[PDB]
Amino acid sequence: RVNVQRPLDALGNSLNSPVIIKLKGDREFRGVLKSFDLHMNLVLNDAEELEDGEVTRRLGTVLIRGDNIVYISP
Amino acid sequence: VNVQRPLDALGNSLNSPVIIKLKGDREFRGVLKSFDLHMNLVLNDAEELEDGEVTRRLGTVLIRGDNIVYISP
Amino acid sequence: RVNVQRPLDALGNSLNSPVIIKLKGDREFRGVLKSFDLHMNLVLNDAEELEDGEVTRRLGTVLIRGDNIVYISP
Amino acid sequence: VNVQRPLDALGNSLNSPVIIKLKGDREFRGVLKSFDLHMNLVLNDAEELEDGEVTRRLGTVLIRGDNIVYISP
Amino acid sequence: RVNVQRPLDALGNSLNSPVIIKLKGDREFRGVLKSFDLHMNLVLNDAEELEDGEVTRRLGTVLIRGDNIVYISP
Amino acid sequence: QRPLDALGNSLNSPVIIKLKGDREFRGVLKSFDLHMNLVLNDAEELEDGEVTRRLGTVLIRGDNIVYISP
Amino acid sequence: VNVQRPLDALGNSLNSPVIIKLKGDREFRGVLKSFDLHMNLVLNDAEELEDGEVTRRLGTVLIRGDNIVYISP
């Protein structure tokens, strides 16, 4: 299901489906996962940005730098 | 655990419940399903805690190793 | 549209197109993407630094250091 | 202790009680079982302290090196 | 004026010309760019530090470490 | 062309280690590497000048160091 | 200074007074004696400042490069 040595496959298993991205310092994105690399840089389509639990705006496409990521959940 | 391989502690916890303490004093409890040398890891049936209070439940979650303070089997 | 393993093709796809940049510390920039590298260092032309939706400064061209970027939205 | 390798101080503390001080004013105590060059390390019968008082017991724990301020063998 | 893959070449375009350096913590420096490396470490001559639009210090020659930089503009 | 020598010339001597967050340590330099990770003996931690705690031996990670004064 | 060698600025400042601005806004002033590519450096007769006023006097101090904002000869 998730190769015990490849945690990032969890992202692969979720391509083109809705995911939750928790960022550092209270930000969060919810959108369709379209792409990602080993650094966890990733692209979401039709994404909503949330700050402190509230929606700030919706972005057609967004590239998130992996270094700002805390966790990802399908 | 080889005195030169701290990560072996992780391998010895695969499929077993663990507590992940993140920076910013955030906490996660769940079943360790995967991990790499950077300590990125996947938990199943996970729960996010805040002051001993579950604030979120996730069936599966990928945690970046850079934000981890400690992992307790 | 973007290769599932190359999140950066989203930037390649946006060369010479308007983009929004969100930096750590909440600073925000808008401009025409002209260049970028794997570190996400990038150059914008006709850039505008924003705050509360207000343009607090304009720069004909600016080089932004990638390590300060949270996200980029084409 | 080789003046060319301070980590030897860790090697000399293997299986002995140590004190770990993390950034953010967090502190741990327990038996050192393993560690690497990054200073990631495992403690057994570990305890987390706050003002000298023991807040919680974690048993086995893997601590990431990047969060360490100092280690008192 | 810069290769789409070489954003740092924007620095080369400013050599011996005045530039504006914005650092973390909302600090700004202006001076003539004299040198720079791949880390964005750079040296300014006749440098001045600004705040609210006014020079708060005159530093003359100064070496600025790249990891503190947010952006650079001609 | 090698500042790390300054430390070498201080081996077995009392030094002052100033860390980030305004924390300060004083002890006898016993060992150190290129990353500036170092070991102090009879180390003393202090705040506002007053010693807060004592450590017979401590390993300090270089990445937390602001400066070292012999 | 060579347009490709920013470090020459330090070379040209050896045995000369310099101002070191550190992250956390601390300020140090003293005579530059040595430095490496990582910008670690040694100052003689260093003085620490705060809001423009001295705080401490040091005879010799080694400053780690990673904490530096800028160095002004």
Short mmCIF file of C-alpha atoms in Angstrom, two decimals:
data_model
loop_
_atom_site.label_atom_id
_atom_site.label_comp_id
_atom_site.label_asym_id
_atom_site.label_seq_id
_atom_site.Cartn_x
_atom_site.Cartn_y
_atom_site.Cartn_z
CA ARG A 1 0.00 0.00 0.00
CA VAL A 2 2.75 2.43 0.94
CA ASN A 3 6.15 0.87 0.48
CA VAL A 4 7.58 0.90 4.01
CA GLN A 5 10.57 2.76 2.59
CA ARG A 6 8.74 5.23 0.33
CA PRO A 7 6.43 7.52 2.39
CA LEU A 8 6.13 9.79 -0.65
CA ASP A 9 4.20 7.06 -2.49
CA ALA A 10 1.30 8.21 -0.32
CA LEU A 11 1.25 11.29 -2.57
CA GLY A 12 1.46 9.20 -5.70
CA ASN A 13 -1.49 7.10 -4.53
CA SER A 14 -3.51 10.35 -4.34
CA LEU A 15 -2.69 12.03 -7.67
CA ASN A 16 -5.62 13.84 -9.29
CA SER A 17 -7.74 13.57 -6.16
CA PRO A 18 -8.62 16.07 -3.35
CA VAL A 19 -5.98 16.43 -0.61
CA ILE A 20 -5.27 18.54 2.48
CA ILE A 21 -1.93 20.34 2.81
CA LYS A 22 -1.06 21.71 6.26
CA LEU A 23 1.60 24.42 6.09
CA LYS A 24 3.75 26.05 8.75
CA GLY A 25 2.37 28.91 10.82
CA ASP A 26 -1.38 28.17 10.56
CA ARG A 27 -1.94 28.06 6.79
CA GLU A 28 -3.71 25.24 4.92
CA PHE A 29 -4.58 24.39 1.32
CA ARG A 30 -7.25 22.03 0.05
CA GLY A 31 -7.26 21.16 -3.65
CA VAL A 32 -6.64 18.49 -6.29
CA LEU A 33 -3.07 17.14 -6.23
CA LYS A 34 -1.60 17.36 -9.76
CA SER A 35 2.17 16.98 -9.31
CA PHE A 36 5.00 16.60 -6.75
CA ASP A 37 8.73 15.90 -6.45
CA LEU A 38 11.02 14.38 -3.80
CA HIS A 39 11.26 17.73 -1.99
CA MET A 40 7.49 17.70 -1.59
CA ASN A 41 7.11 20.73 -3.83
CA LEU A 42 3.66 20.20 -5.31
CA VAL A 43 0.94 21.57 -7.53
CA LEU A 44 -2.75 21.76 -6.68
CA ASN A 45 -5.62 22.78 -8.95
CA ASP A 46 -8.84 24.50 -7.83
CA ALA A 47 -7.39 25.06 -4.39
CA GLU A 48 -8.70 26.94 -1.39
CA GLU A 49 -6.30 28.69 0.94
CA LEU A 50 -7.20 28.72 4.63
CA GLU A 51 -5.62 30.77 7.39
CA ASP A 52 -6.42 30.10 11.04
CA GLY A 53 -9.23 27.77 9.97
CA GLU A 54 -10.89 30.27 7.62
CA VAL A 55 -10.91 30.42 3.81
CA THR A 56 -9.01 33.42 2.41
CA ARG A 57 -9.34 32.73 -1.33
CA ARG A 58 -9.49 30.16 -4.13
CA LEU A 59 -6.63 29.71 -6.63
CA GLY A 60 -6.97 28.05 -10.04
CA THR A 61 -3.50 26.53 -9.71
CA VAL A 62 -0.85 26.80 -7.04
CA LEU A 63 2.69 25.57 -6.64
CA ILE A 64 3.58 25.04 -2.99
CA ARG A 65 7.23 24.85 -1.86
CA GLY A 66 7.75 21.67 0.14
CA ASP A 67 9.83 23.35 2.87
CA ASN A 68 6.68 25.09 4.18
CA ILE A 69 4.78 21.82 4.57
CA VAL A 70 3.99 20.16 7.90
CA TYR A 71 1.76 17.29 6.73
CA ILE A 72 -0.38 16.02 3.85
CA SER A 73 -3.57 13.97 4.10
CA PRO A 74 -5.75 12.48 1.33
CA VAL B 1 19.19 -0.95 17.92
CA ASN B 2 22.72 -0.54 16.55
CA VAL B 3 24.41 2.21 18.59
CA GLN B 4 25.10 3.83 15.22
CA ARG B 5 21.61 3.45 13.73
CA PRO B 6 19.00 5.49 15.66
CA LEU B 7 16.57 5.01 12.76
CA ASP B 8 16.42 1.29 13.55
CA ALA B 9 14.14 2.40 16.37
CA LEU B 10 11.72 3.41 13.62
CA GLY B 11 11.95 0.11 11.79
CA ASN B 12 11.23 -1.69 15.05
CA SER B 13 8.01 0.32 15.27
CA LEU B 14 6.55 -0.39 11.83
CA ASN B 15 2.86 -1.27 12.02
CA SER B 16 2.92 -0.29 15.70
CA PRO B 17 1.32 2.77 17.38
CA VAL B 18 3.61 5.77 17.79
CA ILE B 19 3.61 9.32 19.10
CA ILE B 20 5.06 12.01 16.85
CA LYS B 21 5.95 15.28 18.56
CA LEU B 22 6.15 18.13 16.06
CA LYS B 23 7.70 21.57 16.49
CA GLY B 24 5.32 24.36 17.43
CA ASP B 25 4.36 21.79 20.04
CA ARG B 26 1.82 19.95 17.88
CA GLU B 27 1.22 16.23 18.41
CA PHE B 28 0.28 13.15 16.38
CA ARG B 29 -0.58 9.61 17.40
CA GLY B 30 -1.12 6.73 14.98
CA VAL B 31 0.23 3.56 13.39
CA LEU B 32 3.60 3.99 11.65
CA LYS B 33 3.28 2.61 8.12
CA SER B 34 6.36 4.01 6.36
CA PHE B 35 9.47 6.20 6.73
CA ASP B 36 12.61 7.34 4.92
CA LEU B 37 16.04 8.52 6.07
CA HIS B 38 14.80 12.11 6.33
CA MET B 39 12.22 10.85 8.78
CA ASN B 40 9.29 11.70 6.52
CA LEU B 41 6.70 9.15 7.61
CA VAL B 42 3.18 7.87 7.10
CA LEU B 43 0.70 7.11 9.85
CA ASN B 44 -2.64 5.35 9.50
CA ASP B 45 -5.69 6.03 11.69
CA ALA B 46 -3.98 9.17 12.96
CA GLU B 47 -5.18 11.80 15.43
CA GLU B 48 -3.80 15.32 15.86
CA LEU B 49 -3.54 16.52 19.46
CA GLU B 50 -3.36 19.93 21.14
CA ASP B 51 -3.06 20.15 24.93
CA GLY B 52 -4.07 16.52 25.30
CA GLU B 53 -7.10 17.19 23.11
CA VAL B 54 -7.77 15.61 19.72
CA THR B 55 -8.30 18.45 17.25
CA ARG B 56 -8.39 16.37 14.05
CA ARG B 57 -8.66 12.77 12.85
CA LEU B 58 -6.97 11.52 9.68
CA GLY B 59 -7.24 8.04 8.18
CA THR B 60 -3.79 8.50 6.65
CA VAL B 61 -1.24 11.28 6.85
CA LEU B 62 2.24 12.02 5.54
CA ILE B 63 4.41 14.00 7.99
CA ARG B 64 7.56 15.81 6.83
CA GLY B 65 10.61 14.81 8.84
CA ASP B 66 11.93 18.36 9.19
CA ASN B 67 9.11 19.35 11.55
CA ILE B 68 9.61 16.45 13.92
CA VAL B 69 11.03 16.88 17.43
CA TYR B 70 10.77 13.25 18.55
CA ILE B 71 9.11 9.93 17.82
CA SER B 72 8.02 7.68 20.69
CA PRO B 73 7.23 4.01 19.97
CA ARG C 1 -1.35 19.82 -17.91
CA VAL C 2 1.79 19.41 -15.75
CA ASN C 3 3.91 16.26 -15.50
CA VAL C 4 2.98 14.49 -12.24
CA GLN C 5 6.66 14.37 -11.26
CA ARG C 6 7.79 17.85 -12.29
CA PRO C 7 5.82 20.40 -10.16
CA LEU C 8 8.07 23.08 -11.63
CA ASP C 9 6.65 22.73 -15.14
CA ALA C 10 3.86 24.87 -13.64
CA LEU C 11 6.37 27.72 -13.67
CA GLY C 12 7.63 26.77 -17.12
CA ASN C 13 4.01 26.93 -18.26
CA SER C 14 3.70 30.45 -16.85
CA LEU C 15 6.70 32.22 -18.36
CA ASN C 16 5.62 35.67 -19.54
CA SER C 17 2.30 35.29 -17.75
CA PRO C 18 1.11 37.08 -14.57
CA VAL C 19 1.74 35.26 -11.29
CA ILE C 20 1.18 35.79 -7.58
CA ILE C 21 3.95 35.12 -5.10
CA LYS C 22 3.33 34.63 -1.39
CA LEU C 23 6.41 34.97 0.80
CA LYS C 24 7.22 33.82 4.35
CA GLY C 25 6.18 36.61 6.69
CA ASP C 26 3.09 37.13 4.53
CA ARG C 27 4.61 39.59 2.02
CA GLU C 28 3.00 39.25 -1.42
CA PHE C 29 4.13 40.08 -4.98
CA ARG C 30 2.40 40.13 -8.35
CA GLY C 31 4.22 40.38 -11.66
CA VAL C 32 5.06 38.80 -15.00
CA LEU C 33 7.25 35.72 -14.56
CA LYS C 34 10.40 36.08 -16.69
CA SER C 35 12.81 33.47 -15.29
CA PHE C 36 13.28 30.82 -12.57
CA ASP C 37 15.60 28.02 -11.44
CA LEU C 38 15.14 24.79 -9.47
CA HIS C 39 15.48 26.69 -6.17
CA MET C 40 12.52 28.80 -7.25
CA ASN C 41 14.67 31.92 -7.35
CA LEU C 42 12.79 33.97 -9.90
CA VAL C 43 12.59 37.22 -11.81
CA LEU C 44 9.42 39.26 -12.22
CA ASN C 45 8.90 42.29 -14.45
CA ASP C 46 6.33 45.02 -13.68
CA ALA C 47 6.17 43.73 -10.14
CA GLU C 48 3.87 45.05 -7.44
CA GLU C 49 4.35 44.48 -3.72
CA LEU C 50 0.94 44.16 -2.05
CA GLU C 51 -0.65 44.50 1.37
CA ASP C 52 -4.37 44.38 2.17
CA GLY C 53 -4.92 44.33 -1.58
CA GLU C 54 -3.10 47.65 -1.88
CA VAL C 55 0.02 48.07 -4.05
CA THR C 56 2.66 49.42 -1.65
CA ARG C 57 5.45 49.47 -4.23
CA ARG C 58 6.20 48.85 -7.92
CA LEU C 59 9.45 47.56 -9.43
CA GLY C 60 10.25 47.35 -13.15
CA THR C 61 12.10 44.13 -12.43
CA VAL C 62 12.95 42.18 -9.32
CA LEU C 63 14.85 39.03 -8.44
CA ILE C 64 13.15 37.12 -5.64
CA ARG C 65 15.06 34.57 -3.58
CA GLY C 66 13.31 31.20 -3.65
CA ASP C 67 13.96 30.17 -0.03
CA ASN C 68 11.50 32.87 1.16
CA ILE C 69 8.64 31.65 -1.01
CA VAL C 70 5.60 29.90 0.45
CA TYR C 71 3.72 29.53 -2.84
CA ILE C 72 3.32 30.75 -6.39
CA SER C 73 0.04 30.95 -8.25
CA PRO C 74 0.00 31.21 -12.06
CA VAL D 1 37.87 12.52 24.18
CA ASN D 2 39.58 13.10 20.84
CA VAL D 3 39.84 16.88 20.38
CA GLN D 4 39.03 16.21 16.73
CA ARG D 5 35.69 14.55 17.46
CA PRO D 6 33.42 15.91 20.26
CA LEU D 7 30.83 13.23 19.49
CA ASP D 8 33.13 10.79 21.29
CA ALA D 9 31.53 12.31 24.38
CA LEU D 10 28.36 10.59 23.20
CA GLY D 11 30.15 7.31 22.60
CA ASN D 12 31.41 7.43 26.18
CA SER D 13 27.84 7.85 27.42
CA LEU D 14 26.30 4.90 25.58
CA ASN D 15 23.94 3.04 27.93
CA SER D 16 24.38 5.76 30.55
CA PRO D 17 21.93 8.42 31.82
CA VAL D 18 22.10 11.68 29.85
CA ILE D 19 20.37 15.05 29.75
CA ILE D 20 19.11 16.46 26.44
CA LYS D 21 18.24 20.14 26.09
CA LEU D 22 16.18 21.04 23.03
CA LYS D 23 15.42 24.41 21.47
CA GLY D 24 12.28 25.99 22.87
CA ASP D 25 13.37 25.14 26.41
CA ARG D 26 12.37 21.46 26.32
CA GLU D 27 14.38 18.89 28.27
CA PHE D 28 14.78 15.11 28.28
CA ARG D 29 16.48 12.52 30.49
CA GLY D 30 17.07 8.83 29.89
CA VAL D 31 19.51 6.13 28.88
CA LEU D 32 21.42 6.73 25.64
CA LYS D 33 21.13 3.74 23.30
CA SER D 34 22.15 5.07 19.89
CA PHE D 35 23.08 8.16 17.85
CA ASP D 36 24.43 9.29 14.48
CA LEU D 37 26.60 12.14 13.18
CA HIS D 38 23.52 14.36 12.87
CA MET D 39 23.05 13.68 16.57
CA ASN D 40 19.69 11.97 16.07
CA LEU D 41 19.44 9.72 19.11
CA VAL D 42 17.47 7.12 21.03
CA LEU D 43 16.81 7.11 24.76
CA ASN D 44 15.34 4.34 26.90
CA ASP D 45 13.18 4.95 29.98
CA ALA D 46 13.07 8.56 28.78
CA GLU D 47 11.41 11.37 30.72
CA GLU D 48 10.38 14.88 29.68
CA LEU D 49 11.00 17.60 32.25
CA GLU D 50 9.77 21.13 32.90
CA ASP D 51 11.31 23.09 35.79
CA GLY D 52 12.97 19.99 37.21
CA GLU D 53 9.61 18.25 37.45
CA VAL D 54 8.90 15.20 35.27
CA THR D 55 5.89 16.03 33.11
CA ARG D 56 5.65 12.74 31.23
CA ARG D 57 7.35 9.39 30.66
CA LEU D 58 7.97 8.31 27.07
CA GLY D 59 9.94 5.11 27.50
CA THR D 60 11.79 4.63 24.21
CA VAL D 61 12.13 7.78 22.12
CA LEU D 62 13.92 8.91 18.98
CA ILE D 63 15.00 12.55 19.11
CA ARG D 64 16.01 14.42 15.97
CA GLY D 65 19.41 16.08 16.20
CA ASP D 66 18.48 19.40 14.58
CA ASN D 67 16.40 20.28 17.65
CA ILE D 68 19.24 19.79 20.14
CA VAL D 69 20.91 22.67 21.97
CA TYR D 70 23.18 20.59 24.19
CA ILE D 71 23.73 17.10 25.55
CA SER D 72 25.01 16.54 29.06
CA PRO D 73 26.60 13.06 29.26
CA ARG E 1 17.55 40.77 -20.58
CA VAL E 2 17.95 37.37 -18.75
CA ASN E 3 17.78 33.70 -19.75
CA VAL E 4 14.47 32.09 -18.64
CA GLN E 5 16.52 29.52 -16.74
CA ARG E 6 19.09 31.85 -15.22
CA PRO E 7 17.33 34.24 -12.81
CA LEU E 8 20.59 35.04 -11.02
CA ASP E 9 21.89 36.65 -14.24
CA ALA E 10 19.77 39.62 -13.24
CA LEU E 11 22.56 40.31 -10.71
CA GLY E 12 25.13 40.39 -13.50
CA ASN E 13 22.96 42.97 -15.28
CA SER E 14 23.27 45.27 -12.25
CA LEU E 15 27.04 45.12 -11.72
CA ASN E 16 28.48 48.59 -11.10
CA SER E 17 24.95 49.97 -11.05
CA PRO E 18 22.74 51.10 -8.17
CA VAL E 19 20.47 48.43 -6.68
CA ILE E 20 17.91 48.00 -3.93
CA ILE E 21 18.32 45.09 -1.52
CA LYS E 22 15.41 44.04 0.68
CA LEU E 23 16.30 41.82 3.63
CA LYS E 24 14.26 39.80 6.09
CA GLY E 25 12.83 41.93 8.90
CA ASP E 26 11.77 44.73 6.54
CA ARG E 27 15.24 46.27 6.19
CA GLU E 28 16.45 47.90 2.99
CA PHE E 29 19.85 48.77 1.55
CA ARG E 30 20.75 50.74 -1.53
CA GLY E 31 24.18 51.05 -3.05
CA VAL E 32 26.29 50.17 -6.07
CA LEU E 33 26.60 46.43 -6.66
CA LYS E 34 30.27 45.44 -6.93
CA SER E 35 30.28 41.66 -6.56
CA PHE E 36 28.11 38.61 -5.89
CA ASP E 37 28.21 34.81 -5.81
CA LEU E 38 25.73 31.96 -6.37
CA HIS E 39 24.58 32.18 -2.74
CA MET E 40 23.58 35.78 -3.42
CA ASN E 41 26.24 37.04 -1.01
CA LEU E 42 27.03 40.50 -2.35
CA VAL E 43 29.09 43.64 -1.86
CA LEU E 44 27.74 47.16 -2.22
CA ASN E 45 29.75 50.39 -2.37
CA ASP E 46 28.38 53.75 -1.18
CA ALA E 47 25.70 51.74 0.59
CA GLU E 48 22.94 53.30 2.65
CA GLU E 49 20.35 51.70 4.89
CA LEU E 50 16.81 53.00 4.56
CA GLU E 51 13.65 53.06 6.66
CA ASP E 52 10.33 54.73 5.84
CA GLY E 53 12.12 56.23 2.85
CA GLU E 54 15.02 57.89 4.68
CA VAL E 55 18.68 56.87 5.05
CA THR E 56 19.23 55.75 8.65
CA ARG E 57 22.87 54.81 8.11
CA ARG E 58 25.67 55.24 5.57
CA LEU E 59 27.83 52.11 5.51
CA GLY E 60 30.07 52.72 2.51
CA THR E 61 31.37 49.29 1.55
CA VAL E 62 29.39 46.36 2.92
CA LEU E 63 29.18 42.62 2.38
CA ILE E 64 25.63 41.28 2.66
CA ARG E 65 25.05 37.56 3.20
CA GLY E 66 22.65 36.10 0.68
CA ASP E 67 20.56 33.99 3.05
CA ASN E 68 19.11 37.19 4.59
CA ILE E 69 17.87 38.54 1.23
CA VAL E 70 14.24 38.72 0.16
CA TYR E 71 14.71 40.49 -3.16
CA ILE E 72 17.03 42.58 -5.26
CA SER E 73 15.98 45.19 -7.79
CA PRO E 74 17.83 47.63 -10.09
CA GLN F 1 42.39 32.19 6.74
CA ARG F 2 41.22 29.76 9.43
CA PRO F 3 39.18 31.18 12.36
CA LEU F 4 38.70 27.68 13.78
CA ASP F 5 42.33 27.83 14.92
CA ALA F 6 41.29 30.46 17.46
CA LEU F 7 39.43 27.62 19.16
CA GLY F 8 42.38 25.28 18.85
CA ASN F 9 44.52 27.80 20.72
CA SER F 10 41.94 27.72 23.52
CA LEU F 11 41.79 23.97 24.13
CA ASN F 12 41.84 23.14 27.86
CA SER F 13 41.18 26.81 28.63
CA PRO F 14 38.10 28.58 30.05
CA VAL F 15 35.88 30.01 27.31
CA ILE F 16 32.52 31.72 26.90
CA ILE F 17 29.92 30.24 24.56
CA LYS F 18 27.06 32.56 23.61
CA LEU F 19 24.13 30.71 22.04
CA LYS F 20 21.01 31.91 20.25
CA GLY F 21 18.12 32.92 22.47
CA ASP F 22 20.56 34.80 24.71
CA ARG F 23 21.73 31.63 26.49
CA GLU F 24 25.32 31.57 27.75
CA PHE F 25 27.73 28.82 28.79
CA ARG F 26 31.15 28.92 30.42
CA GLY F 27 33.54 26.01 30.84
CA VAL F 28 36.83 24.50 29.71
CA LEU F 29 37.03 23.80 25.99
CA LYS F 30 37.88 20.11 25.60
CA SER F 31 36.96 19.33 21.98
CA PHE F 32 35.39 20.75 18.82
CA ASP F 33 34.83 19.94 15.14
CA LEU F 34 34.44 21.95 11.93
CA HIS F 35 30.69 22.38 12.48
CA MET F 36 31.76 23.97 15.75
CA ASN F 37 30.15 21.24 17.82
CA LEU F 38 32.18 21.35 21.02
CA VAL F 39 32.60 19.76 24.44
CA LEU F 40 33.01 21.76 27.64
CA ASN F 41 34.03 20.46 31.08
CA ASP F 42 32.89 21.97 34.39
CA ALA F 43 30.40 23.94 32.32
CA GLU F 44 28.19 26.61 33.87
CA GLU F 45 25.02 28.05 32.34
CA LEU F 46 24.03 31.58 33.35
CA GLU F 47 21.39 34.27 32.87
CA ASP F 48 21.57 37.92 33.90
CA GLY F 49 25.09 36.98 34.95
CA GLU F 50 23.84 34.59 37.62
CA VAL F 51 24.72 30.92 37.11
CA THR F 52 21.51 28.96 36.55
CA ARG F 53 22.87 25.42 36.37
CA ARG F 54 26.09 23.38 36.39
CA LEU F 55 27.19 20.50 34.15
CA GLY F 56 30.28 18.38 34.74
CA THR F 57 30.40 17.94 30.98
CA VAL F 58 28.30 19.14 28.05
CA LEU F 59 28.25 18.70 24.28
CA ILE F 60 27.07 21.84 22.50
CA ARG F 61 25.90 21.73 18.87
CA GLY F 62 27.59 24.34 16.71
CA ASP F 63 24.46 25.44 14.85
CA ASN F 64 23.18 27.10 18.05
CA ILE F 65 26.32 29.18 18.59
CA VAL F 66 26.42 32.94 18.08
CA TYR F 67 30.02 33.46 19.16
CA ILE F 68 32.89 32.00 21.19
CA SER F 69 35.06 34.25 23.37
CA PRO F 70 38.31 32.86 24.88
CA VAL G 1 36.91 43.42 -5.12
CA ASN G 2 36.35 40.86 -7.86
CA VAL G 3 32.79 40.88 -9.23
CA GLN G 4 32.76 37.11 -8.65
CA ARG G 5 34.50 37.11 -5.28
CA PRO G 6 32.44 38.92 -2.60
CA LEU G 7 34.74 37.48 0.07
CA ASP G 8 37.56 39.74 -1.16
CA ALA G 9 35.76 42.53 0.69
CA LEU G 10 36.78 40.85 3.94
CA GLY G 11 40.29 40.20 2.68
CA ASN G 12 40.67 43.92 2.05
CA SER G 13 39.47 44.61 5.60
CA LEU G 14 41.93 42.47 7.57
CA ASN G 15 43.41 44.20 10.61
CA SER G 16 40.87 46.97 10.02
CA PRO G 17 37.80 48.02 12.05
CA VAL G 18 34.52 46.48 10.90
CA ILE G 19 30.88 46.47 11.94
CA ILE G 20 29.13 43.10 12.13
CA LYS G 21 25.33 43.04 12.06
CA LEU G 22 23.86 39.77 13.33
CA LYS G 23 20.40 38.25 13.07
CA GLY G 24 18.38 39.23 16.12
CA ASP G 25 19.70 42.72 15.44
CA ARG G 26 22.78 42.41 17.67
CA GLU G 27 25.77 44.46 16.60
CA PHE G 28 29.48 43.83 17.01
CA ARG G 29 32.42 46.12 16.28
CA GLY G 30 36.10 45.22 16.32
CA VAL G 31 39.24 44.55 14.30
CA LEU G 32 38.91 41.76 11.74
CA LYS G 33 41.71 39.23 12.24
CA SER G 34 40.51 36.19 10.33
CA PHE G 35 37.64 34.62 8.39
CA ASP G 36 36.76 31.63 6.20
CA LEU G 37 34.46 30.99 3.22
CA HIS G 38 31.57 30.38 5.64
CA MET G 39 32.17 33.92 6.87
CA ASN G 40 33.09 32.73 10.36
CA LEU G 41 35.43 35.40 11.69
CA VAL G 42 37.60 36.54 14.58
CA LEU G 43 37.62 40.06 15.98
CA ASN G 44 40.08 41.62 18.42
CA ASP G 45 38.83 44.15 21.00
CA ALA G 46 35.25 43.41 20.01
CA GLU G 47 32.40 45.41 21.51
CA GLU G 48 28.74 44.43 21.49
CA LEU G 49 26.14 47.15 20.95
CA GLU G 50 22.43 47.59 21.57
CA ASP G 51 20.32 50.46 20.25
CA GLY G 52 23.65 52.14 19.60
CA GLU G 53 25.13 51.65 23.06
CA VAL G 54 27.88 49.29 24.22
CA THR G 55 26.83 46.24 26.23
CA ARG G 56 29.95 44.13 26.63
CA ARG G 57 33.66 44.32 25.86
CA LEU G 58 35.50 41.30 24.46
CA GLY G 59 39.23 40.97 23.82
CA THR G 60 38.92 38.26 21.18
CA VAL G 61 35.79 36.64 19.80
CA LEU G 62 34.92 34.10 17.12
CA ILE G 63 31.65 34.86 15.33
CA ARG G 64 29.82 32.16 13.36
CA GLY G 65 29.01 33.09 9.78
CA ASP G 66 25.46 31.71 9.64
CA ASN G 67 24.30 34.38 12.12
CA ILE G 68 25.58 37.33 10.10
CA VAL G 69 23.40 39.79 8.24
CA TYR G 70 26.19 42.03 6.95
CA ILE G 71 29.82 43.05 7.48
CA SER G 72 30.84 46.66 6.94
CA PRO G 73 34.53 47.64 6.71
#
